[PDB]
Amino acid sequence: ELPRNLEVFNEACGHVFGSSFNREDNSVISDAAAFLFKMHTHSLDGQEAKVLRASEKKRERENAKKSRKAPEAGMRVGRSLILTSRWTEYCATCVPALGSKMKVIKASGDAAMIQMMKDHNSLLRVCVRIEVWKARYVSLVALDERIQTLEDAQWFPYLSGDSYRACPGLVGGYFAKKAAAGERGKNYKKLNQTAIIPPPRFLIIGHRLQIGDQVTLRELLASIAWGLCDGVLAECWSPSQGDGSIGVVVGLPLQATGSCFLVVASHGLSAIADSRIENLLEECIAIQKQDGVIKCKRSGKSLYHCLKETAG
Amino acid sequence: ELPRNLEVFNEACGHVFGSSFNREDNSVISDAAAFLFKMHTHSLDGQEAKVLRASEKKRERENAKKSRKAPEAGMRVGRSLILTSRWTEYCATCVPALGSKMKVIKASGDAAMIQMMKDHNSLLRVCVRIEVWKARYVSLVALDERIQTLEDAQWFPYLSGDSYRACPGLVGGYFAKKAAAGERGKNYKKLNQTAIIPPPRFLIIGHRLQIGDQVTLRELLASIAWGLCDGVLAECWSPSQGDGSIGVVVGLPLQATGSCFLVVASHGLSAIADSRIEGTNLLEECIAIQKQDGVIKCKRSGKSLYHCLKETAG
Amino acid sequence: ELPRNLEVFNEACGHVFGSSFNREDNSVISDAAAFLFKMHTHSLDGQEAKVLRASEKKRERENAKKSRKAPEAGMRVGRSLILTSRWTEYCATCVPALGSKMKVIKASGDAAMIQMMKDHNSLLRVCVRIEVWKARYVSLVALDERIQTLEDAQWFPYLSGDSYRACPGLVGGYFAKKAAAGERGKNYKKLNQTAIIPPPRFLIIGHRLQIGDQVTLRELLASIAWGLCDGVLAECWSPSQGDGSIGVVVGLPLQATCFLVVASHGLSAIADSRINLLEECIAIQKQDGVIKCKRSGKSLYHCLKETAG
Amino acid sequence: ELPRNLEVFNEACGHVFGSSFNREDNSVISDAAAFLFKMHTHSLDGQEAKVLRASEKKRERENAKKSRKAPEAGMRVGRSLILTSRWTEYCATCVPALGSKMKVIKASGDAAMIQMMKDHNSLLRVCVRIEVWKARYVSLVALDERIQTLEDAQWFPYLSGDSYRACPGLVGGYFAKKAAAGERGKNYKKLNQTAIIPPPRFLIIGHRLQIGDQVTLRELLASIAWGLCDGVLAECWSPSQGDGSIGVVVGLPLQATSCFLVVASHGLSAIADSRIEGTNLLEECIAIQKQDGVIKCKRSGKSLYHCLKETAG
Amino acid sequence: ELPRNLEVFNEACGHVFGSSFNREDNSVISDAAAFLFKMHTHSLDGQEAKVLRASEKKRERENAKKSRKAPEAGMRVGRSLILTSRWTEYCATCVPALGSKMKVIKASGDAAMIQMMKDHNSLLRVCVRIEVWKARYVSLVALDERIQTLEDAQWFPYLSGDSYRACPGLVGGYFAKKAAAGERGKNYKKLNQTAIIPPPRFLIIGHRLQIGDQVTLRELLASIAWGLCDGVLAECWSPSQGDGSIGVVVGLPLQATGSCFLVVASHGLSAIADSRIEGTGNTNLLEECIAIQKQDGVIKCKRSGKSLYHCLKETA
Amino acid sequence: ELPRNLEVFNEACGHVFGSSFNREDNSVISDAAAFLFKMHTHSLDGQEAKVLRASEKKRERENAKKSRKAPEAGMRVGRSLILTSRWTEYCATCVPALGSKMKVIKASGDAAMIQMMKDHNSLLRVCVRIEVWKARYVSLVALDERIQTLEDAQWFPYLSGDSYRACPGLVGGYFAKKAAAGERGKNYKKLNQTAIIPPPRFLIIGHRLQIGDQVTLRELLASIAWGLCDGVLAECWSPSQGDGSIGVVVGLPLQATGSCFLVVASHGLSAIADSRIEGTGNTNLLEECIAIQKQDGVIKCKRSGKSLYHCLKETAG
RNA sequence: AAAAAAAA
RNA sequence: AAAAAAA
RNA sequence: AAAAAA
RNA sequence: AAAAAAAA
RNA sequence: AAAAAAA
RNA sequence: AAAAAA
């Protein structure tokens, strides 16, 4: 009785990869989601060409991609995924045609086309959620070449335009910089670099990440934070008997998705730019435990650096 | 014996919502006020299209709105409001035609048309006041996405153009920023983010917020402030016996709006940013609360009302 | 008896308001000056539309004003100013046509038209001076919502562009800000925010403000300063016998532009040798002589508010 | 008895002002020097228009000056200076023609013309020195609106380009700023902002300012400093018996116009000042050389202008 | 059994330098590598002229270079290298024609030309690795004139345009400054001033720099650092018995590339622009350490604070 | 016996000045060198004007110079230098024509002209070395008004464009400021303010400065430093027996050039902008030392913390 | 502290 | 409190 | 000291 | 930590 | 590690 | 003083 959102993704994965798609390995699920996302975005070889307003270089690249041979059944996409003959039929029948707009489909009134468009949008959202989680997981041990300063580190992950479009609440990069550094409409969403995302093996089955489920330290760290978040977050994971690279979640930080500490001048008071700093290493984070909420002092070192130092 | 301003609002609400309109619920009154504001602004489906100078996208949107089916009797507007069959008549007779200007109505000399225009203006003012109070109430627990820095929070609330037009002194957002960041005429009003707006249940009956009236903490906080104001304002409320989410107002802050203590440099004298400060612990600042006995100075807390509510939630 | 400017203003006000113009009330004089400035600036209804380079939004307003009926005889102006039946003739005769420029009139060579343009310019200057004085007077007991910081106060008063053009040195506002920001030439005049302006009842008569004149505190303060100026300027006033309402002037401020100590002979420089701001003093020139009065450190408006409480 | 410069100045002023020229009033001498500078600079009405490379706006003013009638005999100059009927003859005879250059005169070989040009140059130098002294004297009790920051005060006084040309090392202003910012050759001179300049009544006589001279406090301060200088320099004066108005000079400041920098070299660190290394500014001292000897007087930390203002209040 | 990359370089060096190319001297290998780099980039006299968009001065220089007599067999290039007569044939057959782009070669489908272009590009990469190592080795005792402040010292090595084209990750200078001070594509590589480059006598045989091989202190320091890096890196070397200017590598620094000390704000915490300096107020920079990978394991060694250039000078 | 440069310089000076040219007086050699540098740059009267891209005022100046009669035979130069009647022949022969460029001469292929141009370039280098040495010697007892702050003293000496073209590594001033500010190619040379330049009586002879040479304090200091350089360098001298005016050199400072104290960040460390000042907070510069190399060895001598001009002023009082 | 490039 | 008046 | 010279 | 709209 | 690509 | 002139 899973939601249609995850049912669509499971059906797509089964149809495109057959039995080679393991629903337990996070790398396998992430690779499958990435391939499905690039298929639904008309980015694979032999797919439609993006030549609406393409420049000379972009036009030539799109022409080469369209002319390039499309993937064939038996091709290796990743490390444990093999395409099936049904992938072509799934692409032809499920992937909406390039440039399709939901308004036109709704006006046409075709129930099948509307359902296909809705499923495509849901699949894009799920794929980009998984891809953001995988970007966090990757950055935990191998940062990007662009991240040099806090001005750069404020916009992670550096995903492509389609990734920003699908889940602009979570995605960042260049397009999030463009949006934030510009006019903001009523439907403008803020970049939640630390919004919770269950691990893909949990996501594709709809499980809600919670206390008491078996996961790895890297899994939880790439779930609730990313490479450059503070190291205190590691306290949300506890190794089990014998460790073995598998433990259990002991809590989840509060105030994860949002934050605000401004106090405007009012009734003769003075405005405060930050209630906290109004000691820096003495800051604490609230963790929700089975017993209740507790305060844990920060460590002052990034999760990336802390993991590097604790590697050995 | 209510003023015509509130009488018009009550009559319109009754006509448009039958008995489904509850006058004791703040949320229901806010929903009714918003619906009336959008109806009188020609924003509902099937109403006149705003195509005087609309751009391509705006022209298309207005045409679609005009072609869209208008609301029908029995439609659910919110959670506890149901439109009546009489609503169409009120929309046809009490809503001024699109583009109507009070100057032309007054020149015509039609008493009925002049009265209709005045009633429409008063209804717009009341609805915008209710809208501002509701925005304050919502912001108490859910801050706006666009509020990231003090620069952004200085223009709260972010309401539409009609909202600023009706009550420029209470409405912020883009239009208040445009007005302040530009030429200011004699008839220029300064945004009062802390203007005391009684809860809609009190506003629609003419009751003036004061000491000794039963309200909720969120109600008082929204009426006298919004989410990002300092938490010391919570001192203005006091729970009654048994709490029960209902208490009583024990005071109202002073200096809610307005004087200037600047001293410009002249005749060799140096400029002074503040006459009082002349002579940087910001947490030692105090607010003047007008209690039943008298004015009392209460130290500031340093945490905004939103953060204080979040921390004290549980 | 009177210079050309004051005589022209007196003639204009007498012609336009008849006997309803009181020559001893500052408020009435200010209202008459404002109305005359509006008439001479083509700001009244039924006058020529300003369309030379106006934007369509401005052209709409200009056409609306042109189509609107002109003021009728007997119309109430301000409080106690009533238009005479002959105001239209004065408007048609003494008001140069829209767009008139002194160069074109001089090229024409008509002495009468040149004198008319000179009278128009003098009337504009006098009316703008009266407007500046009235703005100072209003600011004394009415804070400007626009002025919220020292930067805002630096450009007081905020008058129309015509006011700046007539009196660039006495009018601040947006156009003074633009002139200061933009390129500066010989004709650039800095905003003299504290230039002494005699009260309207004195300005029209040609009596320069001095010591001993029987003036009210508020009008004197408006003459020498405005609301946000330091309260110590109140020392320039003294109540007359029996208090009442009108006092006497005992002195005037000595405007000045410095406690610097330049580095020399190995000595380091000093930005301000006295450095407390409250220890500052102002030189008030009285009949006996100049005396240094310690600054009150409080705004003049707030001093007036406290003394009236 | 007198050098060529002072004799030339005395002759010129006597010829131009007759007996109305007082030889013991600093203000009168300053006004006469200013008028002579204007005359020899062709700055008076009816003199040659400066059009060599003038802009049309400047050519308009030059033409207006040329057309304007020249000053008449008996005209009141300053306060107590009256032009003589023979001033026109002196202006025609002793003022070199506009554009005159020493190279051309030397090429001509006329000894009289060479002497005339030399006297003109000396008169210009003397007049500009007197003008600088008068500017210092005025700044003592009259603040300049232009000066608002130490950068502005770094170029006091603000005199004309002719003044800078006559005495580049004593005149500041726009042209001194141009020279400092611009190229600096072997001929470049720095602005000696506090150079000792004897009062005009002494300068024309040739009496070098020294200890014991009966001078007024204001005029002495102008001689050794100007308005914005520190008040400690007032120690260089002493009221005479019975106070009155004229006192005596007891000493003179030292270092009125060295460098203690030590640049980095051979792995050492640069030093901004050898003395300071080891910082309260008010602790500084100035070496006043007196008749008995040099004494270090603690700085007052206050402006000379405001010291006079407070002692006058 | 060397990779194609190093086999191409060995073949080219042999063909162009006969027996005079000694494969055990770092100076000789570096000189031959620079000569081959300037031959394959068409910079020698008598080669094609770079006149696609050349300015007047550049056009004149290229015309003069083209007109200038080309080197002749037996010419001395360096100190211990002499050209052979075959060099003309090699330059004629192996050097891709001026302006030749890999895309056109691949499109033409000619296997020989594709292999030639691949060989030329791999040779450029090897020669530029050699050139960067030589720049480090030189800069241990004779700093560049352009290096004055950390802003200037941050873009070492200052190598020409083709040097940056071949190896963006290691080569710096004007083009690295340009690339970093501009838009950063996805295929953007960060300048790794302390990337580990084996000495050329090791690079042209595939040996990987590790613990327990004999090198010279300057060799090790210019392999893993340069003149203005901190002096503590000398701890990676240990002299052998009798010194003799030949010792051994006793470690290699950790965290050579990819060091990031930021901590972004999150979950109600304040962002930190640098983990180290923040602390509480104790800004002792001389108390920091570097992690060295010894045979036993990782150890932390306190920094010395004096650049390698200055330390080598003082200990000379 | 002597390299090409010094031989050329001696030959040219002997030709121009006859026997009035003293070979052992530094001031005389410096004056003759300055005059020769003026002659070979076409800066003397009666020589070709520089009008290639000259501004109108520059064109007028050059035309006035050209119209001005050239110096006559026997004309005095400096103090004890007198021109010979053969100076015109040398000026006409050995002075390359204005605008001469080595590339054109090489294209001509004339060995005589090529050698003439090479000798001219070497003469310019020697004359500019002597010019910089004399500028230092002047700054030891006569401070410059143009130098007021360390930013101003950072560009000493202020010499004309030719003095920069001939010796970029020693000659500072406006052109060095321009070169440092502008683009820096591979040929860029940094202003070695305290390079070692043997005195003219030694430079023309070619005897490199070393320990044991009999030299006066002032000329030694102008050799290894200038007026505003720290006084500790005076330790490189010692009065000879019986005091007198000439002593001996006991050593020379080390780190004369190429001093860099930066330490870039690396391997997780924090960058430094200067090794010296960092320490722990104590910025006492008076505790710094300079390494003076002597015959016995290198000794670290504590800095005096006072300018050489000031040290010489005090020792002379 | 060798040669070849090469004016505000 | 009366008057005026959109991305 | 002298010689240049908005 | 939902429905609507929508590239260098 | 594979791909693309000068003042 | 006079002349310019959102």
Numbering used by the authors:
A (entry chain A): 34 to 311, 317 to 350
B (entry chain B): 34 to 312, 316 to 350
C (entry chain G): 34 to 290, 293 to 310, 317 to 350
D (entry chain E): 34 to 290, 292 to 312, 316 to 350
E (entry chain C): 34 to 349
F (entry chain D): 34 to 350
Sentences from the paper on this structure:
The viral nucleoprotein (NP), a key component of the replication machinery, packages the viral genome into protective ribonucleoprotein particles. Although TiLV-NP is considerably smaller than its influenza counterpart and unrelated in sequence, it maintains the same topology and domain organisation. This comprises a head and body domain between which is a positively charged groove, where single-stranded RNA binds. In addition, an oligomerisation loop inserts into a hydrophobic pocket in the neighbouring NP, the flexible hinges of which allow variable orientation of adjacent NPs.
